[PDB]
């Protein structure tokens, strides 16, 4: 599924990501934009044979098959990705775990990603 910006912003809010571990909602929308272009089916293989899955491009090297205790297919649906991301952002480097978030979103006016919805 390709989410619309506002569609995804609403869904992430309903799944409890607003200020989760201190990260405002637009952070999460922004991270999805630059990770998957809002495509829940996005799959990209890493150099090392692992693959990044789903709307937030969660990496099978660590998180699924498995630190989120989930098959990676669970991350490719029109909840699992949110629950795993919540574990990831509690894990060690916060949202810096998503390099694209760090380079494109961190410390910007991320409220823009939810304005007009």
């Amino acid at each position, epitope marked *: 599924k390709v989410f619309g910006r506002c569609e995804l912003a609403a869904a992430m809010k309903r799944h409890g990501l607003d*200020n989760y*571990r*201190g990260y405002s909602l637009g952070n999460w929308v922004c991270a999805a934009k630059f990770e998957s272009n809002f495509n829940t089916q996005a799959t990209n293989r890493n150099t090392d044979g692992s693959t990044d899955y789903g709307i937030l491009q969660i990496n099978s090297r660590w998180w699924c098959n498995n630190l989120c205790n989930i098959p990676c297919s669970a991350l490719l649906s029109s909840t699992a990705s949110v629950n795993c991301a919540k574990k990831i952002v509690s894990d060690g*480097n*916060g949202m*810096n775990a998503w390099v694209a978030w760090r380079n494109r979103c961190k*410390g910007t*006016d*991320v*409220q823009a990603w939810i304005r007009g919805c």
Partner: T-cell receptor
Amino acid sequence: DIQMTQSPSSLSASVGDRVTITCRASQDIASDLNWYQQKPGKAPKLLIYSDSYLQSGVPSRFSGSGSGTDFTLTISSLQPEDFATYYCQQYYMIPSTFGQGTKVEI
Amino acid sequence: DIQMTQSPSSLSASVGDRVTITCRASQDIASDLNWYQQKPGKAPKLLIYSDSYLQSGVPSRFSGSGSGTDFTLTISSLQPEDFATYYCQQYYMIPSTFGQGTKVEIK
């Protein structure tokens, strides 16, 4: 840079009183505000961050409210150990910026 | 929370001296370090962000360097306006956290 406007500059109150400090931001900063307590000669110590999340060891008497451009730090039942300068600092955008502080005497 | 360890705690120096302050982080914080300057009775004033980027109006005598876990603020040719308390602060993770400060006082 984001400009933070903190009031008042100073206040004096009695033990057990409610005290209220305000912090206005020049633009929407969601809830990305730190509240610090600084005692003489020491670094600022974090009390509250984000959407009123209290640091470990901080009494429930401290609470933060607000979002967007309008934030409040309320100290319920002021106690003698609360003597300090309090500061707000936004970390929504780079660079982080401070309000001017509120000196609290008890 | 990330622990920031700042050294020295205090120092005394003369106009024209070089001052060197170190900040270490308990984990890798990439380049996300602020350096603040605080004068008596005033709020901390940001001098440097991203470990080495200078605020407009701050002279190039202030040099931020380092990365990862190891950072340095070097103040060259110390001037009268430079006597103050300096603090490093990481903003890599939430919450931000402060080093304990360095008081830079006149000889």
